[PDB]
Amino acid sequence: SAADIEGAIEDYVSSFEIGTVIDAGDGIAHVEGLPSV
Amino acid sequence: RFGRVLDAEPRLSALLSDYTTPAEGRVALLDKALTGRPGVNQTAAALLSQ
Amino acid sequence: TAGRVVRITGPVVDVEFPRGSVPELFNALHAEITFGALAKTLTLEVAQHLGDSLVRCISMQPTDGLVRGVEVTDTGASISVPVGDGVKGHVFNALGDCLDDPGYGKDFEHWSIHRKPPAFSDLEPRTEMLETGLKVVDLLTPYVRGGKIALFGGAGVGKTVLIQEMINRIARNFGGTSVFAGVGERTREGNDLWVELADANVLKDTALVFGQMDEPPGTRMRVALSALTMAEFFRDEQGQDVLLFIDNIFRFTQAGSEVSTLLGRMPSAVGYQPTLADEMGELQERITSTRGRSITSMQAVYVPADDYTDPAPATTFAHLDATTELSRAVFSKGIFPAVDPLASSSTILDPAIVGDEHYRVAQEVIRILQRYKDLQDIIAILGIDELSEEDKQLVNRARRIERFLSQNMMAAEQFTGQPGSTVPLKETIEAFDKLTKGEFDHLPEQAFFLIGGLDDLAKKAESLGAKL
Ligand SMILES: Nc1ncnc2c1ncn2[C@@H]1O[C@H](COP(=O)(O)OP(=O)(O)O)[C@@H](O)[C@H]1O
């Protein structure tokens, strides 16, 4: 079809920020999440 | 044919390839979008879904 | 078809593209920083292909405010800058944008800043003196018209003052086009040069391309290429003589080494990138005259920590026709320009080109100064009385010679408050021939400090109580 796949992925996305410290030490930290930072 | 069409549209292939998202959703996506068709062998459909 | 930012680490950005849309190396990509305070459009130069459709790029602008996952667009071409007579009289940055008149030149013909150097068959050695009026330069480091001239030296020894002096002496009456590339230098100096060129009326004939030391490493890497592209257009298309002034070319190498480890390359000796010689060679080999097409280029080369053995200046040395090497020791003596006459060199300082008398006088001056350098330590410890009579006479002569190689330059009037002078080459040769023969041994050495020719010497000797 090559087109209904589009609507499929859009419906998927429609149907589909706080980070988290994963490690820290010596004044440096690593944060998972925050995709928009 | 499925491999060729999947190569043609890298967006859908990459979306499926994200194992972070639960696999049930992605296999349902494949079933409803690509694997669910009139002229699709059921054995090939099952193999691809697996 | 657009890519997205994956990793951001300072000036280096990794960008992921769809399969088959990976941009070619050195292509210009565009990304958007939308944060209001720092909103801008980043230009990224593709530096490496990392595999799996990722490319490593160098940003031309600071990446602060950039976000992972933002769309990245491929321009399909390298960074390109405007070319043509229009660029004369205007100030640009490495990306070709006009600074004095933003938006100017957008409709000009644009040339990619990445170019192969001229074919070897098109290269002709240049042997023709370019008289400057500076005694030391004309006597011991004669400059070559259409050749490559460098001013080496550590920080604050007079590289930029001498570049401005050479602008005054050469570009002021040049019949062709001038291109000034400010590579990673002070913005205040750039503004001063812009104002000075406007006042001298030389700006109309000069194109200025500035990438300052506050720019990210990518801009300092590419500004020299941009200015060189303008110069190459003037050489190959307009068919007119070109003056290329670069200050400071070492900043190109330094910026290259700033991103080398962020690009994944294991460091070489003295912290430089493994590709120092190759990148320098490409850039320098583009800066040449070809048969019938002249580029007289003058480069300021910064010597890190006064260490002339440092790989950057050492690698640069091979690319030059004439090298005026400024010394911190000469500087600290108050001798200006702080040229080290025993360490500078010119490829045309031989009897065949400059003539028997010029070569003879230059060699005699160098021999006397070398002997004086040898005797310095003995004079410092055991005193001058313990030297042989001929050695005492030579020491007096050498002190007078080193003072006389000093000169009051026009560009130095802002510092000494004394107007500059210009000495014809023949007068320089005659004066130093007289010196090496001891014809001025009766004058106090202070009479030889920061003057012009023999007329100025007579005047200063009269002022000090002597007479020639
Ligand atoms: N011919 C000169 N006469 C007097 N002072 C000079 C002369 N040349 C340089 N100086 C002094 O040395 C300083 C360094 O010169 P400059 O060329 O700007 O630094 P660099 O050599 O690092 O480029 C000048 O600001 C000036 O004060």
Ligand SMILES: [Mg+2]
């Ligand atoms: Mg300087």
